[PDB]
Amino acid sequence: VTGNNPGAQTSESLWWVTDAGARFGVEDSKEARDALGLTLTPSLAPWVALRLLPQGPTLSRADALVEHDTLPMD
Amino acid sequence: SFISPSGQLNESPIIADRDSGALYVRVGDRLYPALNLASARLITGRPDNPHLVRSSQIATMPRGPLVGIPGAPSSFSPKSPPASSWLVCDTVATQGVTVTVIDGTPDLTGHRQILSGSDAVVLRYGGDAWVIREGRRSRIEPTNRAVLLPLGLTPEQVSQARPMSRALFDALPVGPELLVPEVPNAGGPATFPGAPGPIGTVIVTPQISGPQQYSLVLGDGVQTLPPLVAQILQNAAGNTKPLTVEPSTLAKMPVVNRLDLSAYPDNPLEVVDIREHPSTCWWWERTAGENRARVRVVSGPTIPVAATEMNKVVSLVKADTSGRQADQVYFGPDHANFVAVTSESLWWVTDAGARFGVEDSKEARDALGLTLTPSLAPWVALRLLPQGPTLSRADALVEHDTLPMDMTPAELVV
Amino acid sequence: PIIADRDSGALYVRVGDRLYPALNLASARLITGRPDNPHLVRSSQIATMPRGPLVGIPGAPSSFSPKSPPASSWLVCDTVATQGVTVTVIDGTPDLTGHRQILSGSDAVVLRYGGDAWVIREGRRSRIEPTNRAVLLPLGLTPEQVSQARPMSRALFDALP
Amino acid sequence: SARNVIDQRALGAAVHYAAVDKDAVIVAAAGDGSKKDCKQNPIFDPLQPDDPRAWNAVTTVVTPSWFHDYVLTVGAVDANGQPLSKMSIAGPWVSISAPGTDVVGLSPRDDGLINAIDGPDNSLLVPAGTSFSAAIVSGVAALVRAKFPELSAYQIINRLIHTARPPARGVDNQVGYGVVDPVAALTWDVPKGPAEPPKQLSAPLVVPQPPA
Amino acid sequence: LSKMSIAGPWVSISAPGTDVVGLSPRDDGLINAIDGPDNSLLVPAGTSFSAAIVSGVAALVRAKFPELSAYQIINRLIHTARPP
Amino acid sequence: PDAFSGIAPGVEIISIRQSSQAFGLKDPYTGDEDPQTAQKIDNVETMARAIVHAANMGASVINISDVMCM
Amino acid sequence: ISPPTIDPGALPPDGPPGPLAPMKQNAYCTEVGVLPGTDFQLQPKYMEMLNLNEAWQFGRGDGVKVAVIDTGVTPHPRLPRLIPGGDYVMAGGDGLSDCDAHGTLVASMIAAVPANGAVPLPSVPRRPV
């Protein structure tokens, strides 16, 4: 993600976009980047356009290490 | 083709990416990513397995949002044995109890034994002690010396018994309490002629061979009593000795069968020492076509599972803090996956120990397979497993862009 | 550490000495810590190892193939019908063939939002009012023409500077 | 410290009076880890989704920043956009962030610009931290209130929050809702009501008609 | 605890010195740590607690063998320790 | 409700206060000897007195958990 | 820890600023300077993010009063609209002298006026430290 003006130079957060059209946030820790296989340079995008895609759950190692008996349908 | 396997798009509607195992389903001219095999089968209506296709092919077709039921089963292997066996068992700590459910034939080798005949065990629940024998439970009281003394129990031995799980308490059916049998209208006059005494008096007659025969006067006659039962009446204040009578007059007297003695045993109880047998199980057994299932009780030093397979017991999360759910599940040899219960209801049990309800209609019984006849199982055991959503065709025809998050997970430890 | 049933297609992950069924590939990679792909294993062998409850993140992505094209191109599009609009997001190079054209020079377009009329030209939006005959006439507009302009989507209103 | 917290009733009443009865907007710094008693607070725990801001784990309390219902707390980021994980206190009250490095300003005791202040020794020390990031947000809030004089304090805060660029978790105790964005705050059509979650996420699948 | 105890030639025996617990001064309950110079909550550990454990064991031993002199009680503790 | 307990709940303990960091001398001048070494000689002398006193009280076990490094 | 609760009956009484007990100065005010090699003709790097050259088109914020509660501010020819609000540390202060060299940076970073060929107020009546 980067600013919308034509002269912006920042880079504030990393996102993954699936071909089904949903964005998932990626925690930029060295362990998360290497486990997913995202040790690569990201392409820039404008927030005014990217915000229009629906947001899913965050991807992180500490987040996936959980057990569930059954999952709540709703 | 053998050197570098791959695949081609075909008529089959369930396909999977050979490079990543992602599962897709086609509807119309569009591919939809599916959450699991169960919903993919249920949406298309064909009981089948995914067809492998190369990634470069799947990328050309148009997509759509996610479809299916979240968390549904992901593998199907119908299995139905001729004999069905289930056990609800627990184990006591060296405070606290742990409940384990078993599907399949138990192992009775080693010091394990059936709790039949004169053997019995005492447990505590709800503030009352309970005596378990011959497949039933009965209540007892620590103050009633008249019953404890001839039965062989002791006040210390009754008040110090270990706790019992609520799961086992419901599974075991109740029997009449171990109390002094009351006689209606005791001391009243007998209705039959030649009565040796008033109602509630005990009569005894000798024999040329064998032990003396005891009997009790009732409003309508006399009922024969076993020796151990007679001692309970004799032990309580009362008459010093029973009425001795001639065999011939007693033979002519009207015999009655009105009071029930089902709770009293034949000899003093052989109380099983809970330190040596910290585990007791309830066993339900039935053979296809039999009129009724057989109920038995087992006890031993450890759960009735083989020492070799003791390591592959499944441990559940058990988010429910109430007693209505089990802690562990084990699938022994010749277990049953597809089950029906006593108007009947159909259930599918997964290897992970979850149960899912299946519709009775041809739609579900065709799309998912499961067309064979299910095996029978008892509701008192099956209800102990955690429940998932029902596999109806109306439920799988849903789209999602984000799934709801579970509010009570548990930690995975490496 | 990541294996899949060769017949059932189910996905499993290994931790310690147990096999756990995983919800998706994204969570299987994070748990194992390796950027691998599922290995195909004979179903008869999977049945011999001890199970565990479900693990992972529900609905996470199921396939990873990073990409980095030479240039990044994004579009936010608004299309009106005949009242009502739809918003479309395009990622990649747009197709300019045919009757389509790039707005430049004297070309302009008028749209409505919150009742006000906005003139789009030179890559920006500028407000105008229907009462001011002195400004409308020299520019070539007409009060009727401004009043009849069609709606504008919030997606495009926030995007145009 | 979270232990032996001091009675702040007097401060609580003063904040409510200024924010509600006088419609003032209050901007406060999140605090710098270099201060004598400030210690780093713990962040979100995926194992206990009971409270997304993790209030039960707080160990250091920062006041008046604590009154998250009436005060806007600013965290710090470097000039490139990365959070200054080493000096912001990252509590559950943090709501927004702004730059906090390469500080420049007019000089007291002189008549020109300055860039550093003398330390306790020969060392010449450069200033940095949240105390400057709070000043930046205070400037943007002044411009916005000058353009939308009809809006109340509670509405101006929602205009800044909803226009900021978010972090990978959507809301994070390290930076709050995101990085401030002046041009967006002054021109976007932000909805006037507070945030609300959707009614339901599912929709029925329109299956095609089977062939005869 | 190689990093915290002075290894002199007089050292004769050893005992635990971590995970200390005890009654609380100025209160009526238990405690585990003390406020340091800063607001930091410092946890106590060290030989001053190990000397307490041995003081308790010595009291029990010369309750059972009241006939032994001081020098003999020390030899009874030393000879039964598990050696390095 | 609480698992803690002493090693010998039956003993009787005598308390003597011989050292503390919260107290100081209210005439800091100490003359010829450096104020830091002057304090150690005061501790050695006071320590000997406490041991003799505790012995005459009849204690059979004396515990010293405060020692001086030199 | 639980979210704070408020009781509006406890409002403190209004009155002129003043310390709660008499206080005296204990240390000399800190010195300030410039780092080797800096050039104030280049814009500060933090201004690249704010895009002020586009945001000022709607006006520079005329007519808004901002209160700075801190170590106070020292007057400067670049701050033409500074107002004294009072002092709580010293009983006789106006709250217009930055001994800690902190309030002047925070304040000047918000309202300092850009450079011009001549200053609006050439006077300099400020007292010594």
Residue numbers in the entry:
A (entry chain B4): 423 to 496
B (entry chain B1): 74 to 167, 175 to 316, 319 to 424, 433 to 504
C (entry chain B4): 86 to 167, 175 to 253
D (entry chain P3): 336 to 547
E (entry chain P1): 419 to 502
F (entry chain P1): 266 to 335
G (entry chain P3): 40 to 168
The authors write:
Specialized protein transport systems—known as type VII secretion systems (T7SSs)—are central to the virulence of this pathogen, and are also crucial for nutrient and metabolite transport across the mycobacterial cell envelope. Mycobacterium tuberculosis encodes five homologous, but functionally distinct, T7SSs that are designated ESX-1 to ESX-5. These systems translocate a number of effector proteins across the unique and impermeable diderm cell envelope. Here we reconstituted the ESX-5 T7SS of M. tuberculosis H37Rv in M. smegmatis to obtain a structural view of the entire T7SS membrane complex from this human pathogen.
The periplasmic assembly of the ESX-5 membrane complex of M. tuberculosis is formed by three EccB5 dimers and three MycP5 proteases. The EccB5 dimers assemble in a triangle, which forms a central cavity. Within an EccB5 dimer, two slightly different conformations (that is, inner and outer) can be distinguished between monomers, depending on their position. EccB5 dimerization is mediated mainly through the R1 and R4 repeat domains and is further stabilized by the EccB5 C termini, which wrap around their interacting EccB5 partner to form intermolecular hydrophobic contacts with its R1 domain. To form the triangle-shaped assembly, the inner EccB5 engages the outer EccB5 of the adjacent dimer by packing its R3 domain against the α-helices α5 and α8 of domains R2 and R3, respectively, which results in an asymmetric EccB5–tip arrangement. Our periplasmic M. tuberculosis ESX-5 map shows three MycP5 proteases that form a dome-like structure, which cap the periplasmic central cavity. Interactions between EccB5 and MycP5 are mediated mainly by the MycP5 protease domain and a composite interface that is generated by the R4 domain and loop 6 (residues Thr424 to Ser435) of the inner EccB5. The MycP5–EccB5 interface covers a surface area of about 1,230 Å2, which leads to the burial of three conserved tryptophan residues (Trp437 and Trp469 of EccB5, and Trp523 of MycP5). MycP5–MycP5 interactions are mediated mainly through loop 1 and the N-terminal extension (which run across the top of the MycP5 protomers), and loop 3, which contacts the neighbouring protease domain from the side. The active sites of the MycP5 proteases face towards the central lumen of the cavity, which implies that potential substrates of this protease are translocated through—and processed within—this periplasmic chamber.
